[PDB]
Structure formats: C-alpha cells, structure tokens
C-alpha cells in the first residue's frame, strides 16, 4: 500500500499544472 | 529576345510541378492543424481520470 | 461514484462539447487524407473529372 | 514537397502582396473647395445600409425555396455569412482599396442577389441538388429502421465497438488507447469496405503502373468478335 | 584502423532541413593526393557491406580515389528529418563536402542510392565530376514489384514495439513477415541497443521513412520528379541483365531523358550477364557481378569521370581542341579559335597548388 | 538527349514499363 | 491539362495580361474589350492575323 | 517474314556487346594464364631457401 501507490497521481497533477498559464489558474492548481 | 512567350512556359512548367506535389504540400498543412487539434483533445484525457484520481 | 458536485457537471458537459468540436475537425482532416489516397497525379485527369473530385469549384 | 523559390513572387510596384491599391499613373489626388467649380462623382455614403438590406434580401429570397427545412435555413445562414465576412477577414486591406472597397463589394453582392431573385444563382441550384441527394439517403435509412433492419452505418459502428474491445483486452502492458490507434482501426475497415464495393475507378493507376480504364486493353489479342442479343 | 576511418557521432533530430549533417565511413587511398568518391548505399542498407568491395586488392579501387561511404538523412548515423526531397538531401552533401573541405567529388549509388547520387549532379553539377549508378535509373519505381516489397516490409516493421516486444518476439516477426533473406539480414543488423540498454531501435528512422513510402506520392523515394531536372555531366549505369529494379526493355530510356551526355547502351549503359535471381540486386555479394561492376567502375574513374563533355576520354586532354562559340569571351581583341578546355585540380579551392606552381613557373623563367 | 530518332518512331520513346514483359505496347496514356 | 498544352497556356496568360490592365483605369474593360478585338485586325495585318 | 536482314542485325548486336566487354573477357583469360605462370614460379622460391635450411 505505502509504496508506488501515488506515482500515477503525481503525473496527473503535473500535467494539469503544466497546462496552467494564467496566474489565476496556477492558484487553483496550488489549492 | 522578346521572352514574353517563354515567361508563360516557365510559369506553366512550375505549376505542373506544384500540381504533382499537391498531396505532399497539403498533407504538411494538415500536420500542423492536426497538431492544434491533438493539443485541444488533451484537456479531455485529463478529466476522464479525475474520477479515478479522486 | 453515483453523483458528485453538480457544479462539476458544468465542465463535464463543457469539455464534452469542446472535445466533440475538435473531434469533428479531426475527422475532417482524417477523412480528407483518406479520400486523397485515390486521387493521384492531377496532370493525369481530364478537366471535368478533376472538378468532380473538388466538388464545388464548378459551382 | 515543393515551395515557390522566387523570393520576389509577391512583389508589386505598389508593395508586397498588394492587391488593394495597384500602382497606376492616374493616381487619386485631393480636391480643394475654394478652387473647384464643379465635379462629377458617383461615390456616396449609402453602402452601409445597402450592405444590410442586401443581406436581408438574399436570405429572405433564398428561403422561399427551402420549404421550411430548418436545418437548411441554418446551414444556408452560415454559408451566407461566409460570403459577407470576406472583406472583414481577408488579407487584402479592404479599407485601403483604390476607390472605396465598401461600394465595390456592395455592388458585387447586388449582382448576386439579382440572380437570387430569379432563383437562377448557382449556389441555389447547388443547394437544391445537394439537399435532395442528402434527404434520399436519410429516407433510405428511415425505411430500413422502420422495417427493423440494420443500417450499413450501424453495422460498422457495431463492428468497430467490438474491434476496440479486442484491442484493449490484449493491451494490458499499456492502457493509453490513443485516438491515433482508434483512427487506423476504422481506416483499415473503411479501405476493406470501400474495396468491396463495385465503384468506378478513381485512381489513374492500379497495382501495376497501367491505367485502370476500359481503354487500357493492349496486346495480346484474345477477344473474339462481339456476340449479339439472345432470344 | 588507418584505411578504414568512420567518424563517430549521434543522430540529431532537426526541425530545419538545412541544419542536417551526414555521417559515414571514409576509406583512405593508397596514394597521397587522389580525388574523392562519395557513395550512397541502398536504402536501409549498411555501409559496412560495401567495405570489402572498395577494399579488395583484386579491384584496387582505392588506387584511383578516396571513398566516402556516406549515409543519407534518416539513415544510419546521419541526422534525422522527415523530408526526403532530393534537393534538400542534395544540399546536405554540399555542406558535408564543405565541412570536409571537398571541392568536387565523384558520386555513386546503389539502387535508391543511385537516384540520390544522380540528384546531386542535377542540383549541383559544377561540383560533381561524374555519377556511377548501380542497378538504378532516374525513374518512377513506385509500382515495381521489388519496390512494393521493400515498401511493404518497412510498413510491417512499424508494428513492432521494442519496449514491450522481446528479442525472440522480434526474430519470429522478421522470418514470417520478411521472406527475402537479404532484406531480413539487412534489417536485423540495423537494430541497435542504445547506451544503458534503455531499449532497442532501428538505426534508420522507421517513422519518417514509412510515411514517405506508404503515402506513395511525388516525394516518395520510389518516385523521380520532373523537378529534379537534367544531369549535365558524365554518367555511367550498370545493372544486372535480369534485374527486378531496372528492366532492360524500357527502364533505360529515363537515362537518356535525364542525362544529357549519356551516349547509350555499350558506352555508358551496361548490363551484367547473369541469371534470374531476386538477390542479383546485391552485386557485391556475388563475385561474378562484382568483378564486372568493379572493372567498369575503374574504367569510369580512370578515363571518363571528370572529363569535359566534348572530349572522348582522358587521353584527349591536351591534344583535342574544342570549337569556340563566337562572342563568348570578354576580350574584344581575341581571335576566336579552337581550345582545349580547362580541367582543374580536384581540391583546388581548399589548397594552394595553383599559387605554388605559379611560383615554380617563374623560377624557370 | 536531343537526338531521339526519326519522326516516325517518335511515339516510341515515351513508354516506361514497370514489368519485364516483351513485346511492350508503345502507347503512353 | 492547362499546364502542358501550350495552346491554352498562351491564350490564358495572354488574356490575363490584357484584363489585368483594367487597373490602368482607362474605362470599363467590359465596354472597350470588343473594340480591342477590332483594332487587332487593323494593326494585326502586319502579323497576318 | 523473310527474317534474313534481321538475322544480320542480331549477330551485329551480339558482336557489338562482346566488343563492349573486350576488356573484361580478355582479363579473365589472363587470370588463368597468370595462375599457371605463378604456379611454375613456386619452384624458384623453394630453392632460394635451401641454403638457409642447409
Ligand atoms: C513607355 C513606352 C515606350 C515606348 C517607346 C516606343 C517604341 C520604341 C520601339 C523601339 C524598338 C525596340 C523596342 C524594345 C521594347 C520591346 C518591348 C516589347 O515588344 O514587349 C515585350 C514585353 C515583355 O517582353 P520582354 O522580352 O520581357 O521585354 C524585354 C525585351 O525583350 C528586352 O529587354 P531589355 O532589358 O534588353 O530592353 C528593355 C527595353 C526597355 O524599353 C523601354 O523601357 C522603352 C524606353 C523608351 C524607348 C527607348 C528605345 C526607343 C528606340 C530607340 C531607337 C534608336 C535608333 C537609333 C538609330 C541609329 C542609326 C541611324 O528595351 C530597351 O531597353 C530600349 C533601349 C534601346 C537601346 C538601343 C541601343 C542602341 C541601338 C542603336 C542601333 C539603331 C538601330 C535602329 C534600327 C531600328 C530598330 C530595330 O511585353 C510587355 O511588357 C507588354 C507591355 C508593353 C509595354 C508598353 C508598350 C511598349 C511597346 C512594346 C510593343 C507593344 C507591346 C504590346 C504588343 C501587343 C501584342 C499582342
């Protein structure tokens, strides 16, 4: 359970953040 | 020389080539439009995984 | 899994229509390259036959 | 593939790619009131309203022959706008045209409406022909559905849905069924289906370099005299 | 070691077709100063396979010229770019010749390589001395059965995914999908494992190539476009008697159609006596085919390559005078007459041999 | 080349066949 | 094929070169184009038209 | 048909082709004569080493 269970969840959030360009969107990504 | 008639051949001989390369010229114009289209479809692939991420 | 965030349904239906728009364009470019396979060497077709491949030019 | 190599292809005496104000000797010059006795000019400020009324007539006069087909009225509207938005989106600086582009386009659209008023414009006849060919195919589907029969379009949709399951049922190492894979599956089905049909020859050359026409029958000669009708 | 010297580099994917660099093997000649020969191998075919041909004492080709076994773009170690336009691929050679300080070179090719070689002479003739094409012709070969197979095999190679597929899964795929033994062997040796055994891949760009062939349009390598023009210089063609690529019946006419100086069969066009065998395309494997190609190659390099058009052979240099066209020289007080055309040193631009010999000439006087 | 032959045999030099079949029909479509 | 047949090449580009001169702003090319055809058989006698 | 004149062309075309390969065919004839000549020269190379062996 502990290891490797969050790898996929990091790829998704990373892409969602990369697509963010405006500061407003970047703030929602932080939240 | 009076090359008026030659100028009409050179342009026609050049268009003969552009017609022969129509498929390649157009396919390259679409390679960029498909790039734009594929880029917009990336937003849907992200949303389909939110339910699983949650 | 049953239902969640009826506000989320706003973008579920926005991105779904947004994708349908660009899937229609993807099919346009895809189908054109499909029909283009049978069209070769414009210089080997007659005049009135080329206009039929490019329906609309005669109009 | 092939690109124009001449760098001066779009050069004109008026500038680069200038198709709005070509250079000519009799160029426009200003007029001064204190020195001008009389003048003969046809320019005016009536093009804006003529552009508006022209749109209303072309739309309302073409709808007379749509028979209440709402989908056609909406499709025609989108096509009518494409004809009126030409000066607003063209590369040509329609605002810098020689003697007024506004008057020019309006007078050009009026010639189109004249034909539309008589129902002789090629876009009208093209619309009637294209629509009749479309409704005949939609009615062929309706008659097959009322009979409980399956349409040729559904047989593919159903045949494609199962082909996707077969591919993703074996695609376990990866799980990204891209749109590219989905596409080449359908194309493999379209080529196979299209080749099955008895269609007229579209490509000049078949598998061999030889042309696929009825005229490409060369030696050797093996056909006898033609036979007559049977009783 | 010394005779065999192949520069080492890594392919670079390029967005601009002008920033493309070619890499290949260089074979040094026996003698100090010799003109250079640039040879293009068949598509998807290894340059190493031609080394024993150019390094055989019986043939002794290096005695005549230094050889550059060069890979075209998207092939081997050279840079990668989706376009296969022969004009672009020809400019690549001109930059290579510049970077390597080569004023002018003899061009050769095998199969599709022959097309690439001849294209360079068509686009850059002032810097090409001659062309020697082997089992090729400046012709549209899209519908030749031999090309279709090559076009078909390349498409099958797109199905393999090295990441998931195992080494055994590959070997089984080739034997069943590829029937021709030679093509099979060629493709196997083109497979390489990158550093750190990250994954195996083909040395040639399989994606860019398949699109060129599968699309099957003017830019295809099988096609020869009218845009390529005419080659003005010396050209010699050698192909097997029974060849799937060049049929003696009609595939010789394109040579006359594209090459202005080609005299015809028996002078600039020859066929090697042989049997019907689909492997005859690879002349370097069979001694009988190779011995004839080599002899004809040495004759072209020795007597015909880099010789003025209106001269028969190299023997006529200095003893045959060409007629002059009237009003062709700037000097007005010039008595027009016959002249022997100037033949320059093979690398006169990047050396000072003319400046040096001018000094020695003054010492005599 | 510019010396292709006689005027009578001019329509002969156009055909380019993708196969080894002999004799070859001369007409180029 | 308008790009291989020199007969339609000569006539097409010639006509395009004549109508493009409407930018010289003489008058309606639709009016005086017929007079050009007549004037061509006056001075075209020199060329046997 | 009366193919007499054709037979004279076919024989000339084959001879023309042989003349085109005169260098290759004669060079192959000498490769055998040189092989025979080299074979007889193997004896002198053996006798030269007799003094070194002795
Ligand atoms: C503004 C209009 C001016 C009108 C002037 C009146 C006419 C003068 C006639 C003089 C005879 C020569 C004419 C040469 C121009 C030819 C142009 C031409 O024919 O069109 C080709 C032209 C395109 O073809 P091109 O080959 O690309 O043109 C370049 C030329 O080929 C070649 O290119 P290029 O770069 O080499 O030359 C550029 C061109 C530029 O032309 C201009 O810019 C016009 C400038 C003003 C006139 C200057 C020349 C006037 C004549 C001087 C004569 C000197 C006589 C001295 C006698 C001494 C002995 C006693 O020619 C010149 O440069 C003229 C320079 C003269 C130098 C003379 C050198 C010394 C010679 C001394 C020997 C004396 C022998 C005399 C024997 C009799 C004559 C053989 O077609 C067009 O462009 C269509 C537009 C036409 C423009 C307006 C009409 C102009 C008249 C053209 C004929 C009518 C066209 C429509 C026909 C419709 C049929 C369907």
Task: Give the helices and strands, then pairings.
The structure is cut from a larger assembly and holds two copies of chain A, two copies of chain B (54 residues), one copy of chain D (231 residues), one copy of chain E (365 residues), one copy of chain F (29 residues) and one copy of chain G (49 residues).
Chain B: H1 4-20, H2 22-40, H3 42-47, H4 50-53
Chain F: no helix or strand
Chain G: H1 6-19, H2 29-43
The complex binds cardiolipin (CDL).
Residues 1-4 of chain B line the site of cardiolipin (CDL).
What does this structure look like?
The structure is cut from a larger assembly and holds two copies of chain A, two copies of chain B (54 residues), one copy of chain D (231 residues), one copy of chain E (365 residues), one copy of chain F (29 residues) and one copy of chain G (49 residues). With 31 residues, chain A is mostly helical. Chain A has helices at residues 7-18, 23-30. Chain A starts with 6 loop residues before the first helix and ends with a helix. Chain B is built from four helices and no strands. Chain E has helices spanning 51-54, 86-99, 112-123, 145-157, 167-177, 181-190, 206-215, 253-258, 287-304, 353-364, and strands at 4-6, 24-27, 36-40, 66-70, 105-110, 128-134, 191-193, 200-202, 234-240, 269-272. Helices cover 30% and strands 13% of the residues of chain E. In chain E, strand 9, helix 8 and strand 10 (269-272) form a beta-alpha-beta unit. In chain E, the strands form two sheets. In chain E, strands 1-2-4-3-5-6-9-10 form an eight-stranded mixed β-sheet, with helices on both faces. Chain E has a two-stranded antiparallel ribbon with strand order 7-8. Chain E is of the alpha/beta class and 365 residues long. Chain E contains ten helices and ten strands. Chains in contact: A-B, B-C, B-D, B-E, B-G, C-D, C-G, D-E, D-F, D-G, E-F, E-H. The structure holds cardiolipin. Cardiolipin is lined by residues 1-4 of chain B. Cardiolipin binds at residues 1-4 of chain B. Chains B, H: This is Transmembrane protein, putative. Chain G: It comes from Tetrahymena thermophila. Chain G: The chain crosses the membrane at residues 32-49.
Quick structural gist:
Chain G: This is Ymf66. The structure is cut from a larger assembly and holds 2 copies of chain A, 2 copies of chain B (54 residues), 1 copy of chain D (231 residues), 1 copy of chain E (365 residues), 1 copy of chain F (29 residues) and 1 copy of chain G (49 residues). Chain B has 54 residues and is mainly α.
């Amino acid at each position: 359970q502990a290891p490797g269970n969050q790898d996929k969840i990091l790829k998704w959030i990373s892409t969602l953040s990369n697509k963010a360009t405006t500061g407003e969107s970047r703030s929602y990504c932080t939240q | 020389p009076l090359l008026q008639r030659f100028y009409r051949r050179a342009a026609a001989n050049e268009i003969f080539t552009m017609e022969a390369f129509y498929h390649e010229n157009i396919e390259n114009k679409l390679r960029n439009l498909m790039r734009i289209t594929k880029g917009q479809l990336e937003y849907w692939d992200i949303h389909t995984s939110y339910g699983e991420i949650r | 899994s049953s239902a969640s965030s009826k506000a989320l349904d706003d973008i579920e239906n926005e991105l779904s229509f947004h994708a349908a728009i660009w899937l229609n364009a993807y099919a346009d470019y895809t189908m054109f390259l499909f029909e283009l396979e049978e069209y070769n060497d414009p210089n080997d077709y007659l005049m009135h036959e080329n206009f039929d491949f490019f329906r609309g030019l005669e109009t | 593939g092939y690109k124009i190599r001449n760098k001066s292809i779009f050069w004109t005496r008026a500038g680069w790619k200038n198709n709005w104000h070509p250079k000519n000797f009799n160029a426009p010059r200003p007029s001064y009131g204190e020195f001008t006795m009389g003048i003969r000019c046809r320019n005016d400020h009536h093009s804006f309203l003529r552009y508006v009324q022209t749109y209303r007539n072309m739309s309302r006069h073409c709808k007379q022959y749509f028979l209440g087909d709402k989908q056609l009225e909406e499709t025609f509207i989108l096509g009518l706008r494409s004809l009126f938005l030409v000066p607003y989106d063209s590369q040509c600086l329609t605002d810098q045209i020689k003697h007024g582009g506004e008057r020019r386009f309006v007078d050009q659209l009026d010639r189109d409406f004249e034909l539309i008023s008589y129902n002789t414009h090629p876009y009208q006849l093209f619309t009637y022909t294209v629509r009749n060919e479309h409704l005949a195919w939609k009615n062929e589907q309706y008659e097959k559905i009322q009979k409980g029969e399956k349409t040729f379009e559904q047989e593919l949709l159903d045949y494609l849905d199962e082909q996707v399951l077969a591919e993703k049922a074996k695609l376990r190492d990866g799980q990204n069924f891209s749109i590219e894979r989905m596409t080449e599956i359908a194309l493999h089905v379209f080529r196979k289906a299209r080749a099955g049909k008895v269609r007229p020859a579209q490509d000049v050359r078949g598998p061999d370099g030889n042309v696929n026409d009825f005229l490409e029958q060369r030696r050797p000669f093996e056909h006898p005299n033609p036979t007559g009708v049977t009783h | 070691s010394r005779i065999i010297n192949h520069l080492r580099g890594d392919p670079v994917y390029q967005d601009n077709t002008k920033d493309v660099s070619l890499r290949g093997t260089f074979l040094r000649g026996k003698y100090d100063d010799l003109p250079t020969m640039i040879f293009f191998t068949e598509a998807c075919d290894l340059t190493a396979n031609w080394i024993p041909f150019f390094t055989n004492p019986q043939y002794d080709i290096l005695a005549h010229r230094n050889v550059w076994l060069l890979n075209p773009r998207n092939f081997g170690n050279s840079d990668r770019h989706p376009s296969f336009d022969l004009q672009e691929m020809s400019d690549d050679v001109m930059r290579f010749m510049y970077s390597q300080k080569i004023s002018m070179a003899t061009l050769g090719g095998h199969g599709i390589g022959g097309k690439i070689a001849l294209a360079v002479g068509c686009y850059h003739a002032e810097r090409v001395t001659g062309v020697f094409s082997i089992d090729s012709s400046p012709m549209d070969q899209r519908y030749h059965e031999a090309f279709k197979e090559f076009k078909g095999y390349v498409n099958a190679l797109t199905e393999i995914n090295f990441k998931t597929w195992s080494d055994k899964d590959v070997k089984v795929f080739l034997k069943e999908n590829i029937k021709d033994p030679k093509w099979r062997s060629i493709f196997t040796n083109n497979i390489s494992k990158n550093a750190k055994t990250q994954s195996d891949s083909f040395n040639f760009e399989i994606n860019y190539l398949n699109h060129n062939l599968n699309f099957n349009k003017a830019d295809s390598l099988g096609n020869w476009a009218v845009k390529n023009g005419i080659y003005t210089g010396r050209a010699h063609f050698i192909f097997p008697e029974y060849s799937r690529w060049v049929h003696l019946a009609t595939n010789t006419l394109p040579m006359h159609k594209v090459c202005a100086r080609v005299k015809g069969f028996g002078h600039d066009i020859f066929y090697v006596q042989g049997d019907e065998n689909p492997l005859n395309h690879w002349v370097y494997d069979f001694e009988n085919y190779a011995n004839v190609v080599a002899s004809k190659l040495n004759k072209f390099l020795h007597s015909y390559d880099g010789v003025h058009a209106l001269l028969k052979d190299r023997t006529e240099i200095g003893n045959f005078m060409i007629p002059d066209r009237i009003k062709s020289r700037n000097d007005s007080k010039h008595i027009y007459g016959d002249y022997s055309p100037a033949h320059l040193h093979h690398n006169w631009r990047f050396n000072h041999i003319y400046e040096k010999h001018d000094e020695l000439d003054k010492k005599l006087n | 080349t510019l010396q292709w032959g006689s005027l009578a045999e001019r329509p002969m030099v156009d055909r380019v066949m993708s196969t080894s079949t002999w004799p070859v029909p001369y007409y180029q479509r | 094929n308008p790009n291989t047949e020199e007969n339609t090449i000569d006539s097409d580009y010639l006509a395009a070169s004549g109508t493009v001169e409407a930018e010289k702003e003489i008058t309606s090319i639709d009016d005086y184009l017929g007079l050009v055809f007549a004037i061509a058989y006056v001075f075209g006698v020199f060329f046997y038209v």
